[PDB]
């Protein structure tokens, strides 16, 4: 007696218009499926689009969705709201499928869709034989990359000039670039947000370091979403990573459906999807797969009676939450970002990424990084 309509929650933050569009498109494609086996049920999203994720509106949204009887919550977080959301989801046995930045110690009902950028960066650094470079980073996605870089520098005797550019303006960027050029530092690794990375690239072009002799390694999951035309014209080395393969039948089918979408009804469809929207689509597919698998095991998920006050004196968790977590961690599907499979800690495994280098014609695939095969060049 599986329910005909399962209720999921959704927690979206500022500057998440295209990801919400991908979520709604995936909901549309799942609900209106001509196949009777792809959709044995319906997905009911209880959506909260907050503007400031400050651990108080996040808590209010989580409690409002918990009172509605949701089973799993597709949530996005930042550095100021990851801990509260993860603790609330782990305490009440409510699954949290998140496409945001992965963290450590985030087991117990948290499933992260974003692959870690730790092994690929080190496998690109040691292959390029870099022993003295600059690391322009920010702390909006944790400290894992910086800690790994410092550990590798200590274990290999490198010279990493680590600079935090969280509170750096444009003229400060120009002064920093000139100062680094004075010390003959021509090898850089940039790990910042998308807007910060674009501002850094614009300042680099404006001050004039986009010419031959300068090497930049972009620590990002999407390399085709950043404009590097003037870097192509200048001839500087630019190396980056890509997660979604645009020459994949599933991805091309999504692109065909995406270019046929109306911008007035699906905002953010005027541009090709980023890796965040791809992770959102894969997360919705993973939720559909685990709900179908729960239907296969004849588990009647029902939060009747358990719904109530989030901050109750006796912490009463969902009795079937552990089954949902196990079924969510036992999935193995193929989708936009390739193979989606999770370990017992809720982190993605056997994920394949493509390393791209900037040449005169443009971006050029030079190899692939696999979780079990490290870096393999063509």
């Amino acid at each position: 007696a599986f329910p005909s309509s399962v209720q999921i929650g959704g927690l979206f933050i500022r500057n998440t218009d295209q990801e919400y569009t991908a979520f709604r498109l995936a909901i549309f494609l799942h609900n209106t499926s001509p196949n009777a086996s792809e959709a044995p049920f319906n997905l009911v999203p209880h959506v909260d689009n907050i503007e400031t994720a400050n651990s108080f509106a996040v808590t209010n949204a989580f409690c409002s969705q918990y009172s509605r009887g949701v089973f799993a919550i597709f949530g996005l977080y930042d550095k100021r709201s990851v801990h509260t959301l993860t603790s609330f989801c782990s305490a009440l046995h409510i699954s949290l499928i998140t496409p945001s930045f992965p963290t450590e110690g985030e087991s117990q009902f948290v499933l992260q869709l974003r692959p870690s950028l730790r092994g690929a960066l080190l496998s690109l650094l040691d292959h390029y034989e870099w022993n003295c470079f600059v690391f322009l980073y920010d702390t909006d996605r944790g400290y894992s990359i910086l800690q790994a870089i410092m550990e590798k520098a200590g274990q290999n005797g490198w010279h990493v000039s680590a600079i935090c550019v969280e509170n750096f303006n444009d003229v400060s960027y120009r002064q920093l670039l000139e100062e680094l050029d004075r010390r003959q530092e021509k090898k850089f690794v940039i790990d910042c947000e998308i807007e910060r990375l674009q501002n850094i690239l614009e300042q680099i072009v404006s001050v004039g370091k986009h010419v031959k002799g300068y090497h930049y390694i972009i620590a990002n999951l999407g390399f085709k979403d950043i404009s590097l035309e003037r870097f192509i014209h200048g001839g500087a080395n630019v190396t980056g990573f890509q997660l979604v393969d645009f020459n994949t039948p599933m991805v091309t089918k999504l692109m065909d459906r995406w270019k046929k979408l109306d911008q007035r009804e699906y905002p953010g469809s005027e541009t090709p999807p980023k890796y965040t929207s791809a992770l959102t689509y894969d997360g919705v597919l993973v939720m559909a797969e685990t709900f179908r698998s729960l239907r296969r095991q004849k588990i009647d998920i029902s939060r009747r009676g358990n719904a109530g006050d989030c901050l109750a004196n006796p912490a009463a968790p969902w009795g079937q939450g552990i089954d949902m977590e196990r079924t969510l961690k036992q999935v193995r599907i193929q989708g936009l970002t390739g193979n989606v499979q999770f370990d017992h800690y809720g982190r993605r495994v056997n994920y394949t990424m493509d390393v791209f280098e900037l040449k005169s014609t443009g971006p050029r695939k030079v190899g692939y990084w696999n979780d079990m095969d490290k870096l393999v060049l063509i």
Partner: protein, 221 residues
Amino acid sequence: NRVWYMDGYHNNRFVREYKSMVDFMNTDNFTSHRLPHPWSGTGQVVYNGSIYFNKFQSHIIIRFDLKTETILKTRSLDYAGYNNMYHYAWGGHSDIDLMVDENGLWAVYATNQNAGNIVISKLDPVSLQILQTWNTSYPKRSAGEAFIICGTLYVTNGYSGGTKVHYAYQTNASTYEYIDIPFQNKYSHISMLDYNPKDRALYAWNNGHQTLYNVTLFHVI
């Protein structure tokens, strides 16, 4: 041209009867009328010779006379949330919003069956009976406010800061469209935004101040 004034959203039961706009802009003299039950939120309406409001922590719509001071109809909105479960973005027990347009009396609420999305309903001005319901695809808890011009529901995106008309739903064709129509939130937090067809104007409550917007409408031939 008598304006109607209400303060608070939890337990107040006093309404004000400033008889004129000049008696409301400058004159601080008013008549205080009591209600049989206090209202919830800032979503009420004054239509014809009565006032439609919500009854405390319930999904009950009450029609009250402002001249004879009695109750004629008190019904329950079908499958409507109450007591801060399907409120606006600003909260304040604004689970049910009542408005009027050139076609009549409309109620914007949310339904558990329709997730938490905005559901529109046309109400009988006399019997308070459901005439027709429309399903929209915009969640109510992230709306902040909404208003109907004539058969079209326009939904805002926020309540303090950058506020704009974000969603539009045509019930005649039952079609939705995301538009970008900025409006200036001068006094930060907004609480109520309703439409008056006689003045063709938006009445708004901005952080304890009473504000008016004059709208612009276009028709394609």
